[PDB]
Structure 1
Amino acid sequence: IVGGYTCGANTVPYQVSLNSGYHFCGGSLINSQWVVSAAHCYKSGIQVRLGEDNINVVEGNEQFISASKSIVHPSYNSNTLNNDIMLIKLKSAASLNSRVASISLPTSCASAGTQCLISGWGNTKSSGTSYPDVLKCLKAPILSDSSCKSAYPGQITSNMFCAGYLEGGKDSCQGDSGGPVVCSGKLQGIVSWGSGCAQKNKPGVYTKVCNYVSWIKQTIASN
């Protein structure tokens, strides 16, 4: 996250870190046994880490659970990142409390202008790298589809939305992929992609979760 602030330990209780020997993507806990992330974050041997603040120090509220199965969206296209969403089922259910809790899926899609909270352990610099050990947060608005397609001609589909600042300086970044975009207590986006990070007129692009609620609910019900 570039231009954000330190969230504070366990104030984003649904945030998870996907680990394969190291942190490589974020995710969101939607119920005690399922996590949603970005399809481009897929790999085998994923351990899901809940209740994390500093990912290099066991501070006491962590739950490390391995995934039993991963389901990448049937129409995921890795060249265009269209339908960049995946579900991960945990081998055992997590113990939910105030520091580890699930986030609700949306009943309606959010409109441009809505302010949301984006979080993650990704790079904090636009040029150069500095990965934080503790969770960073950014409050950003969803941009209109017109501004979004204007910033990324020929690359935005109905399954994506842009959120951020056209002026630059504040954005999610590498290492934040797969994480949450929460607006009014509902999970509306998944950090997906961007051109660089926090550059002027290049806002972040997010998977539009409201378009996958039926697929998520049906998949969970049968697996």
Structure 2
Amino acid sequence: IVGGYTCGANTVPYQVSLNSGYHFCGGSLINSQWVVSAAHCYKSGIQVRLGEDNINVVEGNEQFISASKSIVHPSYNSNTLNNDIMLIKLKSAASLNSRVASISLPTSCASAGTQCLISGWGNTKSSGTSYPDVLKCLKAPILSDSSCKSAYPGQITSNMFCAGYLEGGKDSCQGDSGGPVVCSGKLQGIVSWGSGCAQKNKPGVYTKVCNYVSWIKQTIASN
């Protein structure tokens, strides 16, 4: 997250870190046995780390649980990042508590200008690299579909939305991928892609989770 703040330990209790020997993407806990992340985050051998704040120090509220299965959306297209969503099942259920909590799925898509919270352990530099050890947060509004599609002509699909600041400064960035965009208590977005971070007229692009609720519920219920 560029231009954001330190969240505060366990303040975003549905944020998980996906680890494969190191942090590589975020995700969101949607019930005790399932996480939703970006399909572009797929790899074999994922460990889900829940209850993290500093991802480099055991602080005493973590749960580390290996994935038993990954399910990439059936229409994920890695060339265009259309349908950039995946499901991850945990080998054993997470222990739900104040610091390890699920985030509700949306029932309709959210309006332009709705305020959202975006979080993750990604790069905090818009030019340069610096990775934070503690979870960072950003409040960002959903941008109109028209200003999203003007920002990235030819590349925004009905399954994507932009959130951020056209002026720049304040955006998600590398290593935030797969993590949550929560709006009015609902998981509305998954960190997906963009052009650099925090550049003028290049806001973050997010997987539009409201389009996927039936797939998410049917897939979980069948697996």
Q: Where on the TM-score scale, by shorter chain, does this alignment land: which range?
A: over 0.9
- Name the residue aligned to 2:99: 99
Q: Deviations over 1:19-77 (max 9, x none)?
A: 00000000000000000000000000000000000000000000000000000000000
Deviation at 1:127, TM superposition (A): 0.7
In structure 2, what is the Cα distance between the partners aligned to 1:65 and 1:35? 11
Which segments of 5 or more consecutive residues in structure 1 lack a partner in the other structure?
Answer: none
Q: Deviations over 1:95-114 (max 9, x none)?
A: 00111000000111001010
In structure 2, what is the Cα distance between the partners aligned to 1:130 and 1:94? 31
Give the paired residue count. Answer: 223
Q: Deviations over 1:97-144 (max 9, x none)?
A: 111000000111001010000000000001110000000000000000
- Name the residue aligned to 1:84: 84
In structure 2, what is the Cα distance between the partners aligned to 1:22 and 1:28? 18
In structure 2, what is the Cα distance between the partners aligned to 1:183 and 1:31? 18
In structure 1, what is the Cα distance between the partners aligned to 2:77 and 2:205? 15
In structure 2, what is the Cα distance between the partners aligned to 1:48 and 1:92? 11
CA RMSD in angstroms, aligned pairs only: 0.3
In structure 1, what is the Cα distance between the partners aligned to 2:41 and 2:99? 24
**Partner SS, residue 84 of structure 1:** coil
**Partner SS, residue 148 of structure 1:** helix
In structure 2, what is the Cα distance between the partners aligned to 1:39 and 1:182? 18
- When normalised by structure 2's length, the TM-score is 1.00
In structure 2, what is the Cα distance between the partners aligned to 1:6 and 1:183? 19
**Partner SS, residue 212 of structure 1:** helix
In structure 1, what is the Cα distance between the partners aligned to 2:185 and 2:77? 29
In structure 2, what is the Cα distance between the partners aligned to 1:32 and 1:148? 34
In structure 2, what is the Cα distance between the partners aligned to 1:222 and 1:139? 35
In structure 2, what is the Cα distance between the partners aligned to 1:214 and 1:44? 25
In structure 2, what is the Cα distance between the partners aligned to 1:12 and 1:157? 29
Which segments of 5 or more consecutive residues in structure 2 lack a partner in the other structure?
Answer: none
Identity %: 100
In structure 1, what is the Cα distance between the partners aligned to 2:11 and 2:184? 15
In structure 2, what is the Cα distance between the partners aligned to 1:208 and 1:162? 9
In structure 1, what is the Cα distance between the partners aligned to 2:106 and 2:28? 13
Q: Deviations over 1:141-179 (max 9, x none)?
A: 000000000000000000000000000000000000000
Deviation at 1:189, TM superposition (A): 0.2
**Partner SS, residue 220 of structure 2:** helix
In structure 1, what is the Cα distance between the partners aligned to 2:146 and 2:222? 38
- Name the residue aligned to 2:127: 127
